[model samples]
Target: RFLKVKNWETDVVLTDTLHLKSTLETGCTEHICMGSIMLPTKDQLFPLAKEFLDQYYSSIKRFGSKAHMDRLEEVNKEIESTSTYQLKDTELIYGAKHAWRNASRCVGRIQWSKLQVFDARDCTTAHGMFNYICNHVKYATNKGNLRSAITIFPQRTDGKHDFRVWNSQLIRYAGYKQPDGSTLGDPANVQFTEICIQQGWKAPRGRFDVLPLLLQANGNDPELFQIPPELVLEVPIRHPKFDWFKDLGLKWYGLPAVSNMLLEIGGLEFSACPFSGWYMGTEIGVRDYCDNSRYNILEEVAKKMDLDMRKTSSLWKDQALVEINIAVLYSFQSDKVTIVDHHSATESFIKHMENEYRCRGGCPADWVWIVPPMSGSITPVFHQEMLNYRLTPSFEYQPDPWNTHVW
Candidate 1:
């Protein structure tokens, strides 16, 4: 571990060692480190003739005369610093050339797309020009995931990180605080059953499709959303069987029903309800030929009327993911049915969704179900208009105390 960490200390040191070894073995050193780090070639930046001159016009202008001597002095200082470190002129010229390439496309009227690399030492403000070019390239490359990344990690979640997933890529082990002021190492309700499946276990009766609905119902309520202390639930359907009640002591949880918090892996067309975070009403078609066993099982799960989702007036606030407990069951000869009472399990799911969805308060029970276009033949319990519910868009940041940043 010590050696591993020591090796990671500096990329430059590693490159230098490789260069030394290569120089001894071959008559010449091939600058392989440049391509290893993907640093641009010298010729890529310092092309010859008028196009190069025009490309680095501002840089040349900055170095041309003594009118703006202060700025020139600063540029010269940067060049000297790069030289002292033996940094390639092109690398120094475009110091931040690769930055922001993940989010932006092009800056207005800068001819950014047609940008040509010129000699770093020749550009007067190569540092700034390099910065512009680097960022422009980066933004142009990574436009897709940037929007989602920014939306989830807002500055108010704790500023300085307007878009970072974490402070750094290295796994953060030291305990930290959650948005709700809860510290790290605090027990959370979420769990992943897929881990168990990897070890050759099979959870026969996984939490069915009913989980999301329970969460949605409770999600309507401002209170009871976080499920309080923690959650205990079943494993995914494909895992090996285990005795949840005997081993986990799930029955002692003191809840009438245990809502299944189903993972939103992919969309199921038969699912008329808004199973994902988006609000879709339940489909209560009494007569859709009910041939599909999956549909029947889901219907059975939904009809239990679990009170676990009753709208209490507290616990409603901004939240991340909800913790949930799951029970893993094995099926015997007759396709087993696990009956959790409607009161506790359902309510837990409802409360979970309440916090997950960020619903202001309790939504009407009617909004939980919606008939799909295919199921339009059947009369449903709730009117389509009454079933409409709202979903909170992911978190976003606005500049505090107001400066620029049109976000």
Candidate 2:
């Protein structure tokens, strides 16, 4: 069967074909799968893997590395013989670092090569997955001084189910819908929170309650593990000038550990790779605290600032937005948390581009994400045109586990 899909990037029709042996065959047919629609065939995978291997060799070319030419040839042979290959420790570490650098949406890729990698592929039990993630959270959190790190579980094996981490993030605030028709904490997590309650897990009382980690290994039932409060660092947001802001009880996690995204290395999918980076101030201040669907605190903040709320020319919303961001930066710094301001972040991104040009041929960037949410025109990235494209050894967004037919 053949299906016609829209190629929005070029305004072309993508014709995809599938061979069905029986009428009862169940899988994607007419509808295009998000990332899987462009699954690389065997012929495609070999060249991509070879290209990644060549880049890997270039990255590790130093004085002592010249002595290890034989091992490099062995790895190259292994890539050709098997569709699935076991990466050496050095190769895995280098690949993980490059993956961060190649991520188009990230603004803080300047720190890519400094990331720490934890190998947890041998773990098979649900409890083991929880323990491994707990350690990752503690080490990455670094007691409010965050460090960039990724803990990778097993990759997909031939004819076997893939290991999965179901949570959006390793640590997130729980949202509880109350009888009064208002949410208690993060509104984004309401559906996941409900699933936890249904699975016989206890819910917390107050707003900003930390949700437990939900993980599953190789088609087993998902398990819940609560993170220790001390291991999870949080910053209590308060304005430097406004003492009244403390009364609002606003705070956020010190580290953001993304869990659900798939990490692709040499066409092998590591579904349970969880990674963290320190926040860029606006992510917490503007979007999380002030978005209309989120906390919706613009009106309250404007009232507290006593700005003229009558007219758009008064710029009440803009004034309140600036103060909220200021509070986030101030609070994180006061708590000794590692956070970057938008100005510094954009400046570092410019440096990243220069470095990439010298090392690699070019850099790929998503303009919408690279530019800051506020003051876009003022930033250097806004003026520069970017080319966004897919690169191997990358992290791609995956569909929700519950939405898929197979676990």
Candidate 3:
């Protein structure tokens, strides 16, 4: 079935070609997406700050020169007299590397113009955004030799002083809550590890605990911090040939930053930006240790590899999901660290969507997050035909600071 669809209004019939991404339209008819949105202030921030200052002066080729229409009337007269405006510093370093090249659910936008922006917006305390997030996790974990950085704090203004970052990642992990409701650690940060133990934190109630770095600045209250465990860079998992896979003790953590993404540059809204990149070994052996809501440990690593625990054709869950992604790529290549393998990260995102379709014509893809939840038929982007539109100085989702501050 190459293709065939019908459901102008839920007639629900979609003959294969992998259900054509449920017949495209995330740019909706109701619960909207004229472009993956967010409530931009000041009447849509002056046409998204003059459409990102005319895509940043047509990316420096100078689009309507006269010095690009006098720097878009000096950022439209600094947003009509200070409603919001100011980016130049190389336009906040090319809108934070063009929001990682318009992140369409990033399959590592082929290292999107090698990012490393870090401005810090002249921090103003939340202990200087935790000393600028521990020097951005020690310069993006240069210890384990990873890089891709991003830092930039202080942007959102007057929703009573916004500038959040209540850690959904700046290296998080700690869950506790057991008593049989099971979740020793990392059940997706069990409600932000009980909001960092109701903001007093002391959770050594282990299973790999390591969470603390709240920081809400100005729209105050939140301000936790901790993080400096030698700038976190763990690895440990094993099994080059299962010495009982290091008896399943497992370990993981090596700068995957992403602290509450909201840096929407060009309509400026970096609600405490934080970012880092490095890691793809099936994002730690298939969604962090066999996702059955995480750490399921695949039936005890398929009953210690004897498999066939009452056969389902004994594929035994892709044989303990490829030996836990070959012990997370032989424990991140025997701890050299910087991981990638998921068939060379989908063959470098299929040559980064053919260089974003021969340099920008179309490349917003999301084939169920660029395929590989453990090789969907020998990778190669599973048999392309993707599209999941949503762009413009990227990274959006902003809301949890205990549901919009006041704490």
- Residue-pair clashes per prediction, in order, are 53, 0, 0
- lDDT of each residue in 21-79, candidate 2, tens digit only: 11112224467423223322456655656566666776666423653555556655775
User: lDDT by residue for model 3 over 154-211, one digit each (tens)?
Assistant: 7877678887878878886787778888788778888888887888988888888778
* Candidate 1 structure quality by residue, lDDT tens digits, 1-407: 10110112122111111111110121114554221221122232122111222223333454344534543344445434432112234422322121111011111101112223332222222233223323322332232111001000001112221221111110111222357664322021112222222323243322221111111111121111111122212222221333222332211111112111111100100000100010011211111112242122222322232323233332221010000112211211012322222223333333332332242122222222222322232332212222111111101122211132222
* CA lDDT scores, all candidates in order: 0.21, 0.78, 0.77
- What is every candidate's alpha-carbon RMSD to the true fold? 26.4, 8.4, 17.3
Rate residue 166 of model 2 by lDDT.
Answer: 78
* Model 3, C-alpha of 401: deviation from truth (Å): 10
Query: Where in model 1 is the C-alpha error above 4 Å?
Result: 1-231, 235-384, 387-407
Evaluate residue 196 in candidate 2 and report its C-alpha lDDT on the 0 to 100 scale: 81
Error of 1 at 51 (Å): 48
| TM of each candidate vs. truth | 0.15, 0.84, 0.37
Regarding lDDT, does 1 or 2 come out ahead? Answer: 2
